[PDB]
Amino acid sequence: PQITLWQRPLVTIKIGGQLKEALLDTGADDTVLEEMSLPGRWKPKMIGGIGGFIKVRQYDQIPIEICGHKAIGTVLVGPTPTNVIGRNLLTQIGCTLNF
Amino acid sequence: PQITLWQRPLVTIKIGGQLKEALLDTGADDTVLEEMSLPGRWKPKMIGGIGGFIKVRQYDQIPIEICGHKAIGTVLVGPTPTNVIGRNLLTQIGCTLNF
Ligand SMILES: COC(=O)N[C@H](C(=O)NN(CCC[C@@]1(O)Cc2ccc(cc2)C/C=C\CNC(=O)[C@H](C(C)(C)C)NC1=O)Cc1ccc(Br)cc1)C(C)(C)C
Ligand SMILES: [Cl-]
Ligand SMILES: [Cl-]
Ligand SMILES: [Cl-]
């Protein structure tokens, strides 16, 4: 698709068999989702946002579908104001910025 | 142009007579820049992102140039860790996400 930016670029994602809404954020290096259960072991990561730093749980090699496009990558879980899809998965689905 | 998302999508902006580097952020509601002087009236604002909120000054009807494309809009100025161009100016230069 081509998505304009007059409204928030909110899309539907599917992870762990569940649908969620998430924001396509090209200012984000990483993908961060609100609290949820995922399989496997996790590693610690401290990430910084506009308000400061948070601790999150890092899960690697997680399947996730974004607007129907299949990706498999790193997902961070923790106290975020909204689910954000960052460049690590934007690049997997072939996203670019055009103007 | 077409901008790849393998790296952070940084561009040069011209604003208030100054040249600055800033991140094109499709998930950002607002444009927020590190401390700098701008002309005219302002009002304070709290803005939230990962890690919580910071207090900024809001200046409206500010001219800006982004990769050679002129626009005008609201610019927020405060202790942001990094300069972000949000959707309020990205729309004006005809920036879309495509995949
Ligand atoms: C390299 O570090 C990062 O990539 N950090 C990201 C990040 O915060 N990116 N920022 C870009 C903006 C992300 C976001 O768009 C996510 C984000 C999108 C949308 C919401 C909240 C957060 C929804 C709620 C309110 C609206 N708030 C926003 O739009 C705010 C605002 C424009 C006001 C700063 N937007 C954002 O906070 C830039 C940045 C880079 C380095 C550091 Br240290 C700190 C910040 C993530 C924490 C999301 C992974
Ligand atoms: Cl990844
Ligand atoms: Cl505006
Ligand atoms: Cl348009």
From Swiss-Prot, chains A, B:
Whole sequence portion shown: 501 to 599 of 1447
Catalytic-site annotation from UniProt: D25
Protein name (database record): Protease
Peptidase A2 domain location: 20-89
Domain of life: Viruses
Subunit structure: Homodimer, whose active site consists of two apposed aspartic acid residues.
UniProt-annotated stretches for the region Dimerization of protease: 1-5, 49-55, 88-99
Function statement: Aspartyl protease that mediates proteolytic cleavages of Gag and Gag-Pol polyproteins during or shortly after the release of the virion from the plasma membrane. Cleavages take place as an ordered, step-wise cascade to yield mature proteins. This process is called maturation. Displays maximal activity during the budding process just prior to particle release from the cell. Also cleaves Nef and Vif, probably concomitantly with viral structural proteins on maturation of virus particles. Hydrolyzes host EIF4GI and PABP1 in order to shut off the capped cellular mRNA translation.
